[model samples]
Target: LKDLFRYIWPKGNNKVRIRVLIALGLLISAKILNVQVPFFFKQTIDSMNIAWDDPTVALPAAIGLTILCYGVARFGSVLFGELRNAVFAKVAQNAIRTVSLQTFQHLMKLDLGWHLSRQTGGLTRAMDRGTKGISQVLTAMVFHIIPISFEISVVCGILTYQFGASFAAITFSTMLLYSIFTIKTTAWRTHFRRDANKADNKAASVALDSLINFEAVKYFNNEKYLADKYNGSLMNYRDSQIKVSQSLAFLNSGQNLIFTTALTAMMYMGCTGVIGGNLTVGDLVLINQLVFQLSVPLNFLGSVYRDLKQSLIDMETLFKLRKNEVKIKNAERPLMLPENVPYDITFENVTFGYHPDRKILKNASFTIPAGWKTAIVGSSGSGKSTILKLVFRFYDPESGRILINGRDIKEYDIDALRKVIGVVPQDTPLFNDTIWENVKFGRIDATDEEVITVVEKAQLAPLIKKLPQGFDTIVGERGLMISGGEKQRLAIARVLLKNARIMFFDEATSALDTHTEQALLRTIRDNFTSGSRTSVYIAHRLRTIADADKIIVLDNGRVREEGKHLELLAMPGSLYRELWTIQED
Candidate 1:
């Protein structure tokens, strides 16, 4: 409840607070007017008695006024209720926006490990349910639960004053018993509801997973198998839903039994009083109308309670998502890098692993000099990619530290540190947007002239011209609409536009043909050298790194050799020399 309230009464936004107050005032006005409607019925009946007793009582005018007042009271009640809803609409909407936005922002800040561990479909579904739950809960509480509570209190007070203690006692006791049965039955059904939700989430996750890998399913001719798997999950949902229905029926039966018996009891007392000449016919009519009035709100009591419980459950799931602690945090007061100087990165005795039992890098040490090109070469699982992740601060090392410009990377603000580094990954995933839009994503504030210059420099201008839409063409999901080589050049264009002081390439040219790869590399090399930026290359092709200032050969998560490409190639029995010979063939 507190977690939800944080958004409802956000730190700023005074308008929402004022709107809540106005809504509350209208709510009270509506309830007061509603209670008067039954009283007007009693009065109109009394006026009819007066006209019957006296022959010349001016009957038509008297009867007309009573009926008119009755109509106006009923209409006023509905009018106030509608007005209240209008006043609070903005507050409820703002509350939903705040919670959903905060939850999404929190998810973005969470570590990559948390995201990788959870299913995309399940997380998205949870967030959606949470937002809807908050809105429904607030609406029900303000309009139904709170107003019903006020009505109950007023009805009991009027019953005791007009009739006697017996009238109010019966009404209160019946409601007390009704609420007890509802709470007990609802508590029992809570488990079934939770089970149903879990089954539904699993089914959705499976369906989405199968569809996302649509090509794989088609290739293997396993569409039927996937459908059967999804059906199995749906079966679980069906069983839980049946249990939910059965329990709801039981709750409704119990509630109706209690309220009907109480109404009959109240009617008996009113009839006896009229027969004994202790009360007027009008009094009897009032008692009956009031008892029935209580039933209207009472009938929906169980449902309101059930909905509130479900809403709390949904909110708990969302709050738990926010509890995923971020592994990387910025320093309170972080060191800032100078814009003019090139960044010098160093890894000292860095021991790290994704899991404690399996180490990927063991006591690895290396340094890329300021304004120099260094390449790392190794087989798969030799921790070549892991080193880059460490440098990016995606995961901190278990022991030892990484330094930039003689300061520990941890001492720098996380966002500021990333801003100074640029990467061109082996697999580049582009948005489903225009070429102009995708290039501008590198630097959101880049000018049109700057983007065009970057595209030309990365050798993407020729490809852009060939496209029917030119730079405005949409790239399909993950850039599938473009060829592999074109996508690589687009990624290079983004990095060139960003123009960070430190650059990292994970075999950036591996997707292109030898001629195209060489051409792009020459452009990159010239630009990087001319700008005096530090560059790190993770390469498989020995020929590409032959001219690099330094080459580090990784074997079994350890640096086995380090020197210039030719210096290591000159050493006999060296890992770099062996790899060079194997690739040359």
Candidate 2:
């Protein structure tokens, strides 16, 4: 509730503030006029009775004015209501915009662990629903709940004045019963709504997950398997929706019964009053009209309560997401690298794992001296990739520390530290954007000329020239539109454009043919080998790292050998030599 009011009160802008103020005034005007509309209608009917009884006694001017007033009141009520909505439209939309943007920003800032554990489809739905829910809440509170309360109060006061306490008491009791019934039934139905949302999220996530692995499903000829899996999720959603609809029907019927009973009692009182000579025919009509009119707003009470509760539930989901804390927080006074500092990276007896039972890196120690190339070679599941993650600071080691320029990497400001490093991962992911945009993401401020230069250096010129749109063509989601080798070259181009002092390549050229691999490696060996920069390469293809200044061979999370290519070959029982011989064969 506090969060909802904050959006409405401050008004995100001056224009919104002015609009909100005007809308508030219009709301009061509309309700006041709308309530008086029934009273004026009652008076008009009373005036018509006198004219019918005695034509000579009739005051034509008074009757005509009364009828005109009725029309004016009804017209004014509708006009003010519409104008109120128009004026407040910006306020409601801006609130949605504010909440959506804040939620998105917070999600981006959360740690890698939180994101990895989250399902893409479910997370997207939560954010979308939360934003939508906030808008529903704001509009419903202002227009439905508040206005209905005002109308009820006015109707009760009029009933008491005209027909004594009994009529008013009946009206009040009906409202009380109606509210209690709606609240209790809506509360019961909430579980079904929650179940439906969960099932929906599951179905969407399953569908999207399957689509993302479209090639895998086709290759395995398991279309039926995937279809069955997705259909099961859909069936769950259908079942939950059925429960929701069944409960909704029962709640609606119960509400109608209560309303019908109350209306009968109120009308009975009106008829007795007229028969006893205490009320006129007009008085009975007015009483009937008031009760009937109140029924309109009152009828919607069930749905309004149900939707408001759902909105709160949706907002709560996002609140939990926003509350997720990042594990690796920046220091209060983070340090920055000094100009001309050689970023010599070192892992000091580092040990880490995703799970406590299985450690991926165990007391691993290594160093890449400034301006030198250090290559890591290992079999699969030998913690080759884990080294890159640690270097990127995606996760800190459970024990020991990593250092840059002889200082702990944690001490440096994360952004500043990352700014000096470039990365090209094996599984390169791309945004569904133009080739130019994807390349420019590496260095947002780089000009087109700089991007072109890096693209040419990364040997992507041939592919770019063959394309229909050149740099303007869209790389489909995850770069699925391009071949694996082409995507690798694009990734290389991005890192080249970054032009950082330190570069890490995890199987960066694994997708390329021998000829292309050697050409790109030649460029890196020449240009990326400047004395001010350092490069760390993780490779399985021994030929790719044959010329590295040093090579470390890892087996089961432990370094088995370390030397230059020839030195490792000279050793009789070296793991590096054994792997090289097998690859060479």
Candidate 3:
């Protein structure tokens, strides 16, 4: 509730909120006038003590004016309808923006394990429908249904004031029965509608997923199989919708019959009172017209109540989703990074895992002291890439500490800590944007000159010059337009432009050719302080980081060897020796 209201209020205009206020006022006014019209007819008949055809004290002019008032009342009701819809659209748009922003940020912060377990489609649906459900429900319940329900109460008061206790008692009883029967029946009928909506969403999602990979489906010639699957889903959806419509039709038919019967019975009873000399003919006439007028809105009560209930259910789900636990903690007062200080990264027996029992890294300790190349070499499943993630604080170590300079990494502001490191991961996930925009993602504020420099540094100048569009060319999804090697090189250039002190290359050059790797390596070695700026490289190929001042070999979450590469190569019973021999073979 807090999230929903906070999302809509203040962000939505105050004028719009005031409009809701005016709309409510008009709704009340309309309901009152709508109920009062029948009273004027009753007065006209009773004053003369005559039948429907007889003359009355209330003249034709008064009847004409009363009709005009009802017309104005109807106009107000329509005006409120438009006002409510406009406010809801504005509110829904603002809410969708707020929710999407928050959900996207939350997804970004979630651990890799959490993300891997869920599909993109699930997350997308939860976000899209969850916010929309809350917005729509609020619009329907607050502006339309609740206000109209309140009007039901107001109409009861107006009836009682205009008629005697006897007539008022009958009026109250009739509306009471109308509300009770409508609510009970509508509740019984709505589950099919809910099921239909759920089925439709599922079918829509399946169709969308298939379409997104339509090329793959076509290549495999699985069109008939997919069509059958979609048809099955649609069939269930169609059946559920038919059931809902049938149920609503049955309930609405019942309501129309019962309320109309109540109107007829009430009028007959009022006329009998007039005949008995206990009530004026005008009173009987007024009661009859009033009962009929009251029944118009009363008949709609079933629909309004059903809609309100469904809206509440949706709101409940939306609120539940927003309550998901966020793991990352913010600092009460964020400490700034040490000013212009030398870069040093230290890992003191750091350990971590996706879960407690499945340790990926255990008692792993290393340090990169300003400006020497350090490489981690291990086969797959040896926690090679987990090292870079630890440095980035993607997952907190369950045991031990990662420190920058002398301070624990957690003590510094997360943004400040992150801003001081440059990462070039193996996959090089690029956006569907121009070459310059993809590169500029690392350092959003980088100038054209700085961008060009990094391009040259990563040896991408030739490719840019070769393309007719230069840096303006779109890379397509995840840089699909470029070769794997070019994408890796582009990723490297993006990080270089960030101009951070610490650099991490987690199999970052796996896609590059030997010649390109060596050229980029030299440029990186020359830029940072020779022994003062820290760089951690994890490479699969033995020769990639062989010359680093330090080499750490890990296996099964434990460090198997740590020393200079050549020193480990000459050592007895070394994991490094076995890997080197395997690579050579």
Name the best candidate (by lDDT).
1
Backbone clashes in model 2, listed as residue pairs:
none
Q: Supply every candidate's count of residue pairs whose N, Cα or C atoms clash at under 3 angstroms.
A: 0, 0, 11
Worst 10 residues of 2 by lDDT: 49-58
* CA lDDT, every model vs. true structure: 0.84, 0.82, 0.74
**RMSD in Å for all candidates:** 2.2, 2.6, 4.2
lDDT of 2 by residue, 1-585 (tens): 777667767735567677778888888888788777777777878766652565576567976888788789889988988888776777778777877787788887777767788777778888888877877777777777777787778878988887899987888888899889979987888888888777777778878888889899899998898788878888887988788888988988888888788778878988898899988778777777776766766667655555666788788787777777777767888898879766788889989997778898888888778888889888899998788877778888889989887888888888888788888987898889999998898999998999999899889888899998999989898899888988888888899888888888988888889999999999877875457778889888888888899898888898878889999998898888888789888
lDDT (C-alpha) at residue 515 in model 2: 93
For model 3, the superposed segments whose C-alpha errors exceed 4 Å read: 1-23, 37-70, 76-112, 165-205, 208-227, 277-317
Candidate 2: where is the Cα deviation over 4 Å?
10-22, 51-59, 300-308
Error of 2 at 521 (Å): 0.9
lDDT of 3 by residue, 43-111 (tens): 444443445564563556865676566566556666756665676666567667777776677777666
Name the candidate, 1 or 2, with the larger lDDT value.
Answer: 1
Of 2 and 3, which scores higher on lDDT? 2
Ranking by lDDT, best first?
Answer: 1, 2, 3
TM-scores of all candidate predictions against the true structure: 0.95, 0.92, 0.85
Q: Kindly report which residue pairs in candidate 1 clash with one another.
A: none
